[PDB]
């Protein structure tokens, strides 16, 4: 009846930072009952709100072993490939997702809004025709974690 894993916290490290900086998350979870399989964690960058086609899976890791207990790991993943991001979605708000999957089933989804912005007043007001990602600051809106759990089969 009870979910064998619950995620307790996520801390967003090294934020704000350049767009090119790796995403770095401290993730804390409790296992109330020994797992026989690995936990699969993903960081997914939403390249474009309009379409899921533009998702970038920044990394996918298998975490284990998972005996009952309180666990933490730091999940780091390289920044997205700007060559796949639509110019119009580059500057402004998007989302990054952290996801966990057990035996092929996603049981949790943590979302953060991400504001990508120039910091130079010249650029902010007169932004480049094509985005300059070397000059964009990524600000993950860490004070507002959005958390969604899903009922899965833990057997």
């Amino acid at each position: 009846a009870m979910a064998k894993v619950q995620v307790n916290n996520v801390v967003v490290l090294d934020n704000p930072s350049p767009f090119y900086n790796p995403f770095q998350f401290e993730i804390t979870f409790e296992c109330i009952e020994d797992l026989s399989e690995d936990l699969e964690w993903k960081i997914i960058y939403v390249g474009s709100a309009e379409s899921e086609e533009y998702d970038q899976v920044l990394d996918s890791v298998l975490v284990g072993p998972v005996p009952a207990g309180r666990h933490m790991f730091v999940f780091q993943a390289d920044a997205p490939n700007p060559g796949l991001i639509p110019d119009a979605d580059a500057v402004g708000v998007t989302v990054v997702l952290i996801t966990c999957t057990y035996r092929g089933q996603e049981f949790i989804r943590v979302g953060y809004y991400v504001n990508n912005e120039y910091t130079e007043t010249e650029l902010r007001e007169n932004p480049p025709v094509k985005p300059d990602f070397s000059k964009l600051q990524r600000n993950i809106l860490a004070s507002n974690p959005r958390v969604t759990r899903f009922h899965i089969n833990w057997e």
Binding site: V7, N8, N9, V10, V46, A49, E50, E52, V93, T94, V95, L97, T99, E106, R109, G111, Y113, N144, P145, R146, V147, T148, R149, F150
Partner: peptide
């Protein structure tokens, strides 16, 4: 009078809730 999401905000809210879940503020 409750406000409304723009198409982009609404698109991002749907990604955040995944397969039709209830999105909460934080972890507990």
């Amino acid at each position: 009078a409750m406000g409304t999401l723009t198409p982009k905000e609404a698109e991002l809210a749907r990604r955040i809730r995944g397969a039709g879940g209830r999105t909460l503020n934080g972890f507990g």
